[PDB]
Every structure is written in C-alpha cells, then in structure tokens.
C-alpha cells in the first residue's frame, strides 16, 4: 500500500528503459500520458503498454474493468482477483512494482525553498513534528530536512519550540544523512526516519509527524494562488501529490462485494465504504454519506432499473428534499443513468414509493423538477423533492466556465435552506465519484466562504481528501481539480463585486 509504481514524470521510452534495465518479467509501472494513463508491464522480455482512460467518471483499463483509483486497479490485478488477459488470451500478470524515486509528488518536498523561508514557514504554521524537505542552497545537489519540535503551534517566543536542519547527502543517486544507511530515494529516507525518528545527543527526538501544510490559503488571495498554480504545472503537481495519498484510503467494501448486491452496482469495482454506507431500513444501495468535518450529502451512482425503488426508499428514509443529477441519461453512446422520475404532470409508482411530477422549469444549464414523494398506504407522508438535473456538462472534461455551475449550486443551496431540517442532499452522476465529488467539494468550499465571508481559509486538497475518506475516488481528474479551483475563484470575485 505504497503506490511507488506511479511515475509522474516518466515517458514511454523511459518506462521501457527502466523495465528492461532495472526490472524483470512481471515488473510494472503506471505513468501519465492528455488525461489518460498507461500501465507498462514487462512480459516475455519485452514491454506492453495498456491504456487507461479516465474522461472524468472512472479509470477504464482497456481490456479490463472500471476502477475508482489506480491503486485499486493495481491491487485488483496483483492479488489475482482478476486476470489482465490480453486480446490474444495470454494473461498479463502484475508482480513487481518498480518503485519510483521522484519526490515531486510527496507532500513534504519543497524544492525551490531556502532555509530562512522554511524556518519562517515552520515557525508560523508548523507545530510539533511539522517537517519538510528542501534543496540545499549551500551544497548543490544535496537536500535539507527541516523539522520542528516543541509544545505548541505558532510563532511562540518562549524557547519551548525550535527548528532543526539535518543535511541529506545525495551521492551516486543514493540519499543519506552524513552517515549510516543509504536510501534509494528521499521517500525511503523519510519513511525510515518516520518509523525510526532521529535522536539528538541530549534526548531530543526529531519526530516527523506531519508534513508542513502549504495548501491552506486565505480566500482573498486565491487569485494569486491560481496564478502561482498556473506558472508540468502547479495544479498538476498538487493533484498528483493528492493522488499519491489514495493508497491510505483503501477501506472495507465487503457489503458491496456480497453476491446478493453484485447486480445493484452499475460498475463492478466501484463500491461504497462500509463505514459510510447508506443503509436501508434488501438494505444495500451504492451510496455513501458525505459529512464535512451542517449540510450533508449522499453520493450515489446513476440508478439501475433494479435499483430505482431502492433509490426512492433511500430518498424517503433519509428525508432528502433535493436531488442533483449531473449527467444526461446517455453519454457518448453509453447509458449512465436510468430515468427514475415521472414525466411532467404524471404520477408513477416505484415499489412502495409514489412520485408525482408537479411542474418542470427549463433553465439554461439545468432543469428543475418539483416532485412529490409519498408512501403508498399513508398520504400524510407526502413531501416535496426538488430534482436539479444539470444538462450542460460536457461529455469529456469539464465546463470552460464555472458560472453556470455556480448559479446552479446557489439555487440548490437556497432550496435546501428553504426546507427546515431537510435530510442530506442527494448528488449523483454515473459512477457517483467524479462529477459528484466535484460538485460536492465545490458546494462545501462555497458554503464555507458564504458563511464566513472572504476572511476565511480554504484547503482544496484537504477537503477532497476528507471527502475521499467517505467515498472512493471523489473527484477523478486533474481537470475537475482545476475546475474546483477556478469555481472558487469565480465565486470569490462575484462576492467581491
Ligand atoms: C510542492 C509539492 N511537491 C506539491 C504540492 N504540495 C502539497 C501539499 N499538501 C498537499 C495535501 C494537503 C492536504 C491533504 C492532502 Cl491528501 C494533500 Cl496531498 C498536496 N496535495 N500538495 C507540497 C509539495
């Protein structure tokens, strides 16, 4: 569970060179291509490149299956759960992950950074255990590990906290700390000294507890940050650093893997976490609760014809009053969601549930439907559910401008507020992770902003990671990540005007 097999800055020829020179039959590595990826596997003394497409909904292993994360794909195939057979029939077997040495995707690596800058950052934002690695300014080629140790966090003036700088020599492509073991990369060195902290001569234990947070920003300055991330790419490096931490979120999904529930998932290997699974009071639905660390969400898949009734049971049980569909019924020739709502003015029964379609309202980017949900046998249980069906989301990538999405979310939020103590807001697309995660993260950040104003801190990676711990693969592509950033920027600018 390390994910050292993903090389962010490698190309096809370099991957072939690595697999043949420093590898053996069974060695594999994943690499990024424009939005797609490649799994290069050594077999029979040669290399085979399998394409992995991710347009925004899921990872598509050509000749394989759909996955919410590259980590889960590699796990699925290494552990023999599935066999990556080729069109010929011969099995392509993953065996030995060829570890990468590039640290640009590590949370704690800040190349362009001086000693005084790093010490100032640690004094300001770091606490006990906060650490970072930087390039040595006095020794070109070597590095420096700056670690803080003390009692409290912040720029204290009592001598209880302090910053220590440990030199890291890079000799013959191997990293050491002036003596002892020589590690194959900065990552191995950092992990070793995380497990086995250094002890100073007088007792001080240099604990590498958490990396120094460099992503939390004040909203007012997002503009600058965006430019700082636009000058490889800033957005790309930050999103890849976020992806690197996906192997720490492979939680249990046994309920979705049950044989009774197989037919209730649109995609086989995209399942809900057990600890945030939506339980029905026939208890299974591919849905998860998303709770920001007041308004909660339900992230779920597009309805299957055999799950519409369970979907409406969920909406009723959870007392949800707002639904957000971010996909049309068919995309690029494939079906992504079954029509689960009645035609305008019509009334339809889904199992024990009943749904009237009172009125519809066609907007530029979306359609609003005022449905009335009730339970057959008791009319007192009639309630109004407002379905906001977004229709102008491109089949590939993300919108070019976030204004439509922002007004959409603003209306959704006002509607959710109009109903007192309303249940979670249901949000779904196809697999319920890509567009769903993007919309939910944007809604969370914009709610923070609207409540606390411009004078507040926002952390996009932290929010996305908190949401990913509740459903696998929330926010799928770097395009959606940059779109989140740009939508926050646009909302800040509109509020400032
Ligand atoms: C310059 C650099 N090499 C790439 C950007 N940078 C960072 C920092 N922190 C995060 C972060 C923040 C909160 C949660 C999670 Cl999970 C993550 Cl990963 C991040 N994604 N990138 C630092 C190193």
Contact 26, 42 (CB under 8 A): yes
Testing ligand 1's pocket by substitution, the residue of 107, 130, 469 carrying the most ligand atoms inside 8 A of its CB is 107
Is 214 touching ligand 1 by the criterion CB < 6 Å?
yes
Q: HSE-up of 393 (CA within 13 Å, CB side)?
A: 30
**Span from the CA of 237 to the centroid of ligand 1 (angstroms):** 8
What is the per-residue DSSP string for 302-364? PPPTTTHHHHHHHHHHTT--EEEE-S-SEETTEE-----SPPTT-EEEETTEEEEEEEEEE-S
Q: CA dihedral in degrees (432, 435, 440, 441; nearest 10)?
A: 120
Q: Which residues contact 233 (CB under 8 A, 6 or more apart)?
A: none
Pairwise CA distance, residues 161 & 184, whole Å: 32
Strand 334-335 relative to strand 366-375, pairing: unpaired
DSSP 432: S
For the CA of 214, the nearest atom of ligand 1: 8
Contact 101, 183 (CB under 8 A): no
Instruction: List 7's β-bridge partners, or say none.
Output: none
170 is catalytic: no
Pairwise CA distance, residues 99 & 331, whole Å: 37
395 is in an annotated binding site: yes
Nearest to 426 by CA among 340, 297, 302, 252: 297
**Span from the CA of 211 to the centroid of ligand 1 (angstroms):** 9
Contact 347, 354 (CB under 8 A): yes
Q: Which residues contact 197 (CB under 8 A, 6 or more apart)?
A: 205, 206, 207, 208
Q: Measure Cα distances from 327 to 125, 266, 338 in Å.
A: 41, 15, 11
Nearest to 457 by CA among 217, 202, 215, 295: 217
Pairwise CA distance, residues 403 & 400, whole Å: 9
H/E stretch holding 298 reads strand 297-300
- Domains in the chain: boundaries: 1-105, 106-211, 212-497
Is 469 touching ligand 1 by the criterion CB < 6 Å?
no
Contact 270, 431 (CB under 8 A): yes
Query: What phi-psi label fits residue 56: left (phi over 0), alpha (psi between -120 and 50 degrees) or beta?
Result: left
Pairwise CA distance, residues 71 & 4, whole Å: 10
Domain at 1-105: CATH code: 3.30.505.10
Q: Measure Cα distances from 347 to 92, 314, 350, 353, 372 in Å.
A: 52, 19, 10, 11, 9
H/E stretch holding 381 reads strand 378-390
Pairwise CA distance, residues 165 & 470, whole Å: 37
Q: Which residues contact 88 (CB under 8 A, 6 or more apart)?
A: none
The coordinates were experimentally obtained by X-ray
Is 215 touching ligand 1 by the criterion CB < 6 Å?
yes
Tell the CATH topology of 212-497: 3.90.190
Report CA torsion sign: 446, 409, 475, 481. negative
Q: Is 189 helix (H, G, I), strand (E, B) or coil?
A: helix
Please report, in angstroms and rounded to a whole number, the separation of the first and last CA atoms in the chain.
47
> Which segments of 126-212 are extended strands (E)?
130-135, 143-149, 162-171, 174-176, 198-199, 205-206, 210-211
Contact 428, 438 (CB under 8 A): no
Q: Measure Cα distances from 426 to 281, 306, 314, 422, 423 in Å.
A: 18, 19, 9, 11, 9
Pairwise CA distance, residues 135 & 110, whole Å: 8
Burial-class residue 23 by CB neighbours within 10 Å (0-12, 13-18, 19+): buried
Fold matches, 1-105 and 212-497:
no
Pairwise CA distance, residues 361 & 396, whole Å: 26
Q: HSE-up of 301 (CA within 13 Å, CB side)?
A: 29
100 is in an annotated binding site: no
Contact 82, 63 (CB under 8 A): no
Q: Which residues contact 220 (CB under 8 A, 6 or more apart)?
A: 454, 455, 492
Is 48 touching ligand 1 by the criterion CB < 6 Å?
no
Which residues have a C–N gap over 2.5 Å right after them in the chain?
33, 231, 281, 293
Pairwise CA distance, residues 86 & 330, whole Å: 29
Alpha helices in 196-295 (DSSP H): 222-230, 234-244, 254-257
Pairwise CA distance, residues 263 & 56, whole Å: 24
Q: Which residues contact 443 (CB under 8 A, 6 or more apart)?
A: 295, 297, 409, 412, 413, 425
Q: Which residues contact 90 (CB under 8 A, 6 or more apart)?
A: none
- The protein residue with its alpha carbon nearest to ligand 1, atom 11, reads 461
DSSP 80: T
**Reported resolution in A?**
2.7
429 is in an annotated binding site: yes
**Span from the CA of 210 to the centroid of ligand 1 (angstroms):** 11
Q: Pick 106-211's CATH classification: 3.40.50.2300, 3.40.605.10, 1.10.3720.10, 3.30.505.10.
A: 3.30.505.10
- Taking residue 198's Cβ as centre, other Cβ atoms within 10 Å add up to 15
Is 107 touching ligand 1 by the criterion CB < 6 Å?
yes
Pairwise CA distance, residues 400 & 392, whole Å: 11
Contact 428, 300 (CB under 8 A): yes
Cα angle for residues 291, 446, 361 (degrees, 5° grid): 95
């Amino acid at each position: 569970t390390s994910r050292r097999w993903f090389h962010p800055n490698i190309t096809g020829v370099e991957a072939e060179n690595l697999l043949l020179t420093r590898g053996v039959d069974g060695s594999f590595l994943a690499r990024p291509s424009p939005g797609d990826f490649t799994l290069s596997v050594r077999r029979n003394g040669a290399v085979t490149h399998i394409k992995i497409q991710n347009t925004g909904d899921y990872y598509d292993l050509y000749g394989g299956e759909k996955f919410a994360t590259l980590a889960k794909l590699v796990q699925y195939y290494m552990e023999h759960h599935g066999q990556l057979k080729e069109k010929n029939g011969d099995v392509i077997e993953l065996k030995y992950p060829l570890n990468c040495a590039d640290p640009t995707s590590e949370r704690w690596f800040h190349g362009h950074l001086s000693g005084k800058e790093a010490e100032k950052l640690l004094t300001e934002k770091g606490k006990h255990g906060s650490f970072l690695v930087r390039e040595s300014q006095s020794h070109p080629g070597d590095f420096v590990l700056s670690v803080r140790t003390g009692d409290d966090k912040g720029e204290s003036n009592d001598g209880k906290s302090k910053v220590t700088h440990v030199m890291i020599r890079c000799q013959e492509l191997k990293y050491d700390v002036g003596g002892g073991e020589r590690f194959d990369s900065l990552t191995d060195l950092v992990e070793h000294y995380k497990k086995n902290p250094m002890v100073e001569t007088l007792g001080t234990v240099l604990q590498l507890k958490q990396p120094l947070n460099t992503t939390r920003i004040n909203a007012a300055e997002i503009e600058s940050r965006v430019r700082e991330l636009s000058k490889k790419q800033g957005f790309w490096e930050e999103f890849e650093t976020l992806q690197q931490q996906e192997c720490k979120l492979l939680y249990s999904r046994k309920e979705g893997q049950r044989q009774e529930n197989k037919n209730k998932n649109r995609y086989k290997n995209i399942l809900p976490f057990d600890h945030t699974r939506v339980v029905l009071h026939s208890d299974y639905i591919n849905a998860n609760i998303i709770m920001p660390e007041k308004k909660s969400y339900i992230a779920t898949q597009g309805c299957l014809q055999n799950t519409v009734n369970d979907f409406w049971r969920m909406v009723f049980q959870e007392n949800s009053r707002v639904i957000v569909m971010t996909t049309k019924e068919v995309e690029r020739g494939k079906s992504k969601c079954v029509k689960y709502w009645p035609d305008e003015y019509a009334l339809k029964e889904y199992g024990v549930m009943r749904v009237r379609n009172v009125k519809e309202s066609a907007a530029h980017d979306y359609t609003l439907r005022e449905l009335k949900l009730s339970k057959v046998g008791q009319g007192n249980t009639e309630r109004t559910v407002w379905q906001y069906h977004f229709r102008t989301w491109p089949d590939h990538g993300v919108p070019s401008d976030p204004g439509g999405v922002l007004d959409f979310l603003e209306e959704v939020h006002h509607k959710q507020e109009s109903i007192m103590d309303a249940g979670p807001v249901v949000v779904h697309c196809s697999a319920g992770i890509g567009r769903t995660g993007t919309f939910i993260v944007i809604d969370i950040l914009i709610d923070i902003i609207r409540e606390k104003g411009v004078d507040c801190d926002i952390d996009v990676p932290k929010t996305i990671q908190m949401v990913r711990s509740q459903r696998s693969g929330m926010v799928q592509t770097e395009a959606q990540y940059r779109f989140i950033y740009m939508a926050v920027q646009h909302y800040i600018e509109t509020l400032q005007r």
